Every structure is written in C-alpha cells, then in structure tokens.
C-alpha cells in the first residue's frame, strides 16, 4: 500500500515502480474509495525530515534509470546526464541546484556574526581549496584591521574583505559580477536578459564541469577495479564473486518479512527471468508483451 | 515531449537520403500521397495534414528494458569497453607456438627455456582472465553503491563544487 | 535567575515564559528572572538559575533533534 | 509466465528505495 504522503511525491515522478503505485492508487479512487486527509501537523523539524526521507525515495530509483556517459567524447552526453539529474531533482521536489545550495548556505549560517564563523560553518558545502583561499584573504584583511571582520555588509571591514573575495573568485575562474547581478536582479528586462544569458552560460559550464568530474571519477574507479581484477587468475575471480554473491544473498535471506528483503528476492527472480528470456530468443531480446 | 506539437506535412522531408530505402511524397495543397521503396517491399499510402497532427497525440514514451538498471548497464558497458582495450593489446602478443619444437628446446639455455615456458603460461592466464565476461556484471556492482550514495545528497543530486562555489560567492558578497 | 532569550520580550510572551519556567522551581516560588539577549539562539529561551541551566532554546532543540536522528539512523 | 509487461520491466532493480522506506517508516513514527 501507499501511505498518502508517498503518493504526493510520486505524481510528478516517472519511474516505473512509482508510476504503477500512482496508477494503482488512482484505480482505487476510481472505484468509490475516499481520499484521506493530508495531515495538518508535523512541525518544521519533522516536516523537513519527512521531506528528506521522501525525496530520497524519488531520487534513488530515478538515479538508476540515468545512464552515465562513461567514455563518451563531447559535451552533449555530459549535458544530457546533468539535464536528467536536473529533471530528477525537479521531480523529487528539489529546486534549482543553485537556489538549493544557496538556501543551505543561508540555513547553516543564519546567525554567524563574523566572516570566520560563516567560513567555518559552511566549510563542507564549499570546496576546501576555495575555503582555504578565503581563510587567507580573511587573515589578510584581519592583518590590517586587527578586529574580527564583521558579517554585516555595510561595515568597511566587510567591504575590504569583499573587494578581495571578488578578486579570488574571478581568480578561481568564476565570474562574481555576473552571478551577483543575476541574483540581485535588475529593473529593465532588456538588460536583465543580457545578464541572464551570461549567468546561465556560466551555470551550464558549471554543471557540465561538475557532471564531467563525476563521470571522470567513475571512469577512474572502473579502470582501477578492472586493472586490479585482470591481474587475478580465473578461478580466484570466479570463487570470490560467487562467495560475494552468496554472502549478499544470505544477507537478504536472513531478513524475512521485511520489505527490502522481499523486493530483493523478487528482483533476483526478475534477473533470472531476464536471463532465461534472453536464452529463449537471443537475436530478438527479452519478451515484452505489447 | 509537450502536449501539442507543430510539425507535419509542412517543411517536411520531401525525399529520402540513402539508397537502402527510397521515399517520395506528393506535395499537393490539401493532402499528400506518399510512396516508400525499401528493397523488395513497396508501400504507398495517402495521409493528410490532419492525420499527422493526430499522430503526436499519443506519446510513445520509449524506455529501456535493462537487466539490473540502466545505470548498472552503463557501467558494465564501460567496463566491457575497457576490457576490449585490454584485449586489443593481448591481440598483439607474439606467437610462441612457433617456438616449441625441439630445435628450440635443445639450442637454448635451460633457465631461459623455463622463463619462456612461464611466459607462455602467463599469457594463457592473462587471456583466460581478460575474457571472463561473466564477471564484469559483478564488477560493475561495486561502482554502483558509492555512486548512488553520492547522488543521494541532502542538497541536490546534480550539485557539485563549481555550482556551490558560485552560490557561495553570491551568498558571501551580498548584504550580510 | 537570568533568562537568556533571542528576541526582546513581549507582555504575553513574558507571562507565558514565567508560566512555563514556574514548573522548575519546586513550590509556589516567584521567579524574579533577569532578561538577557542572545541572537545566537534561534528563538526559545535559556534559564540560568545560578545553580542549574535549563535549556528551552531552539538551537539546543535542533541539536538534540539531529543527534536523535543520527542516533536512530545508525540503529536501523 | 513469460512476457510480463513493459511497465514491470522498467523498474530499476537493485536501487535501495526500501531501506529508505524501512528507515522512514521507523524513524518518522519514532521521532514524532
């Protein structure tokens, strides 16, 4: 069954095992059943936790339907990959990723009064190289002021910090002026689209380079795993993979009654069906009843 | 695809491009008579402009029937495309079956002969393990869970360091 | 006492504060709490009884919440 | 038996989705 808040995240979802749950719930509602009340409770901590554990049930099956562009030359397979991750994030309830990590920044340091506490509380959500560069810029400003650089914005200590933070930002390759002019907006649309058409080109280069870095990591990991695996003899490979498959099947046969073990065994039987149905007709593929 | 489409019998492909299948249409004003020639079979129907606009009302929605996942099949396709690049340098190994006869056995130093026979045994080991293609489907399930835990973020699945650096420069260089 | 808050006190909020903080002194005690301000707390209050510290704040609540969740997600 | 469907075969198999569901069905009631 579906517990009336799982169905609300799955309407915009498009993976198959969630789409069949939506269609089963709508077939139940067609034959004279009533829709329950959405719970007018669950204060913001439990609400945000339910968001965190309900959007993962859309992200996780939606990741395994996205083919990595491993070993592809060009810029379009990486852009397809990051576009599919964007559409998965938009179907999972996440916002634009720029807006979401900006909200995480403003949520972590809502009450950090100096720039060192902002730069130490969101150390994780920024790269450690850019954070170390901002630490050295902050100590270069504190060497002149000999006071904590106040996180206020109209203080001259923060302005002398910002005039070097923009410098290290353009030194890191990202245009600070374009991003700042986009996120602060503008009045006329004829000059707002001309900064949108530079911010979104930076943004396309940004997620293209990030998805390409993830693809390069998976390529290097697969090359490491294969170049370790090809050194072994055949019998060691066969017995260690049979042992690992047996242990990971015993982990699912140990748990009984739980939903993930039952779905694990149903998926093993579906894999064996796929192998048998390919064996029944190898030039045509698996049998799909249409 | 969207809900409404705006193509059909207007700025259309008037003719085919390759010789494996020959197509011709009749560019009238109201309707069009098509004819398609692909080898031994010949087909020629007659469709209207109001018959192609009914075509994109039902969406096909192609999807991939994979064994485990489309993700796992992509990683396994990459592992097989790497194993092909290892195979293509085991294809350039010099033939040692042409040096097994006893005019090479007895003209050669015994330790160098043991080293040559061990080199042949090592080639048989390497070629029998690079063609263990049933094991790539179990190798590609070791790259999957770390990757899926990376995309299971609290921020966003598509997020990375460059976007976070740009949003940090925006958040830092604003008022407070 | 010493009542460390996040925002300055309002008239109904203050009497609700001395209603909720009265359940810590174990009689009909008249808490003569002092006011302090602390933007670091994200709401709530902190009573400093000068012998004990009662933490009804929000930052302590979300830290105890995150510790409880990070203690339960490892238990399952 | 054979030739199941299409919408049954488009399910990504060894995704987690259920350990996420086994946590979220035992964390959210235990945290309310």
């Amino acid at each position: 069954a579906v517990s009336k808040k799982e169905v609300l995240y799955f309407l915009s979802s498009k993976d198959a095992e969630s789409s069949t749950a939506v269609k089963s719930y709508l077939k139940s509602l067609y034959a004279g059943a009533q829709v329950e009340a959405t719970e007018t409770d669950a204060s913001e901590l439990i609400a945000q936790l339910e968001k965190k554990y309900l959007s993962a049930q859309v992200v996780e099956p939606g990741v395994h339907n996205i083919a990595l562009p491993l070993g592809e030359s060009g810029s379009a397979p990486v852009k397809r990959y990051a576009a599919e991750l964007f559409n998965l994030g938009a179907q999972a309830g996440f916002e634009c990723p720029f807006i979401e990590v900006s909200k995480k920044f403003g949520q972590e340091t809502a009450t950090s009064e100096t720039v060192k506490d902002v730069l130490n509380k969101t150390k994780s959500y920024v790269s450690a190289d850019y954070n170390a560069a901002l630490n050295e810029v902050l100590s270069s400003v504190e060497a002149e002021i000999n006071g904590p650089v106040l996180f206020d914005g109209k203080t001259e200590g923060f302005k002398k910090f910002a005039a070097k933070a923009k410098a290290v930002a353009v030194s890191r390759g990202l245009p600070a002026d374009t991003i700042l002019a986009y996120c602060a907006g503008s009045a006329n649309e004829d000059a707002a689209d001309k900064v949108s058409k530079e911010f979104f080109t930076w943004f396309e280069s940004a997620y293209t380079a990030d998805a390409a870095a993830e693809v390069k990591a998976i390529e290097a990991e697969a090359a490491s795993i294969l170049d370790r695996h090809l050194a072994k003899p055949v019998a060691q490979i066969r017995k260690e993979q049979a042992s690992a498959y047996a242990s990971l099947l015993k982990r699912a046969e140990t748990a009984k009654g739980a939903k993930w073990a039952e779905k694990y065994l149903e998926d093993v039987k579906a894999v064996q069906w796929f192998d048998a149905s390919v064996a029944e007709a190898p030039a045509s593929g698996p049998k799909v009843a249409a | 695809l969207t809900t409404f489409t705006f193509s059909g019998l207007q700025d259309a492909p008037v003719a085919a491009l390759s010789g494996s299948i020959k197509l011709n249409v009749a560019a009238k004003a109201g309707k069009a008579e098509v004819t398609v020639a692909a080898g031994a079979a010949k087909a020629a129907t007659q469709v209207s402009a109001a018959a192609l606009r009914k075509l994109s009302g039902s969406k096909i929605s192609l999807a991939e029937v994979a064994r485990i996942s489309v993700l796992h099949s992509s990683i396994q396709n990459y592992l097989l495309s790497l194993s092909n690049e290892r195979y293509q340098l085991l294809s350039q190994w010099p033939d040692f079956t042409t040096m097994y006869g006893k005019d090479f056995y007895y003209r050669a130093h015994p330790e160098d002969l043991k080293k040559f026979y061990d080199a042949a045994d090592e080639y048989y080991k390497l070629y029998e393990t690079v063609t263990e293609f049933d094991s790539l489907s179990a190798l590609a399930s070791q790259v999957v869970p770390n990757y899926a835990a990376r995309r299971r973020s609290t921020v966003h699945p598509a997020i990375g360091s460059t976007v976070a650096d740009g949003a940090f420069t925006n958040f830092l260089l604003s008022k407070q | 006492c010493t009542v460390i808050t996040a925002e300055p006190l309002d008239k109904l909020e203050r009497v609700e504060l001395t209603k909720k903080a009265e359940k810590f002194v174990d009689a009909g005690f008249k808490l003569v709490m002092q006011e302090k301000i602390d933007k670091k707390l994200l709401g709530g209050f902190v009573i400093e009884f000068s012998d004990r510290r009662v933490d009804m704040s929000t930052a302590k609540k979300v830290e105890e919440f995150n510790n409880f969740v990070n203690k339960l997600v490892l238990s399952i | 038996a054979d030739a199941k469907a299409l919408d049954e075969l488009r399910k990504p198999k060894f995704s987690s989705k259920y350990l996420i569901q086994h946590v979220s069905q035992k964390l959210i009631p235990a945290v309310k």
Binding site: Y125, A217, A220, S224, R251, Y264 | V155 | - | -
Partner: peptide, 30 residues
C-alpha cells in the same frame, strides 16, 4: 551481480575523488 543496499546520505559537497591510473597497460606492455 547484486550490490549492498545502503540507506545513507552524503552531507558535504566534496571532490569526486578521482583515483590513480593503475599500471596495467605498462605491465602488460612490459
């Protein structure tokens, strides 16, 4: 062919941890 199911999140936005290029092509060429 089957993986250990994990139910955990990544909190930080970190580097993708590019591994080192293993030496199979040089060893097999040697």
């Amino acid at each position: 062919y089957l993986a250990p199911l994990r139910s955990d999140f990544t909190e930080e936005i970190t580097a993708p941890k590019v591994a080192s290029a293993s030496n199979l092509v040089n060893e097999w060429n040697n």
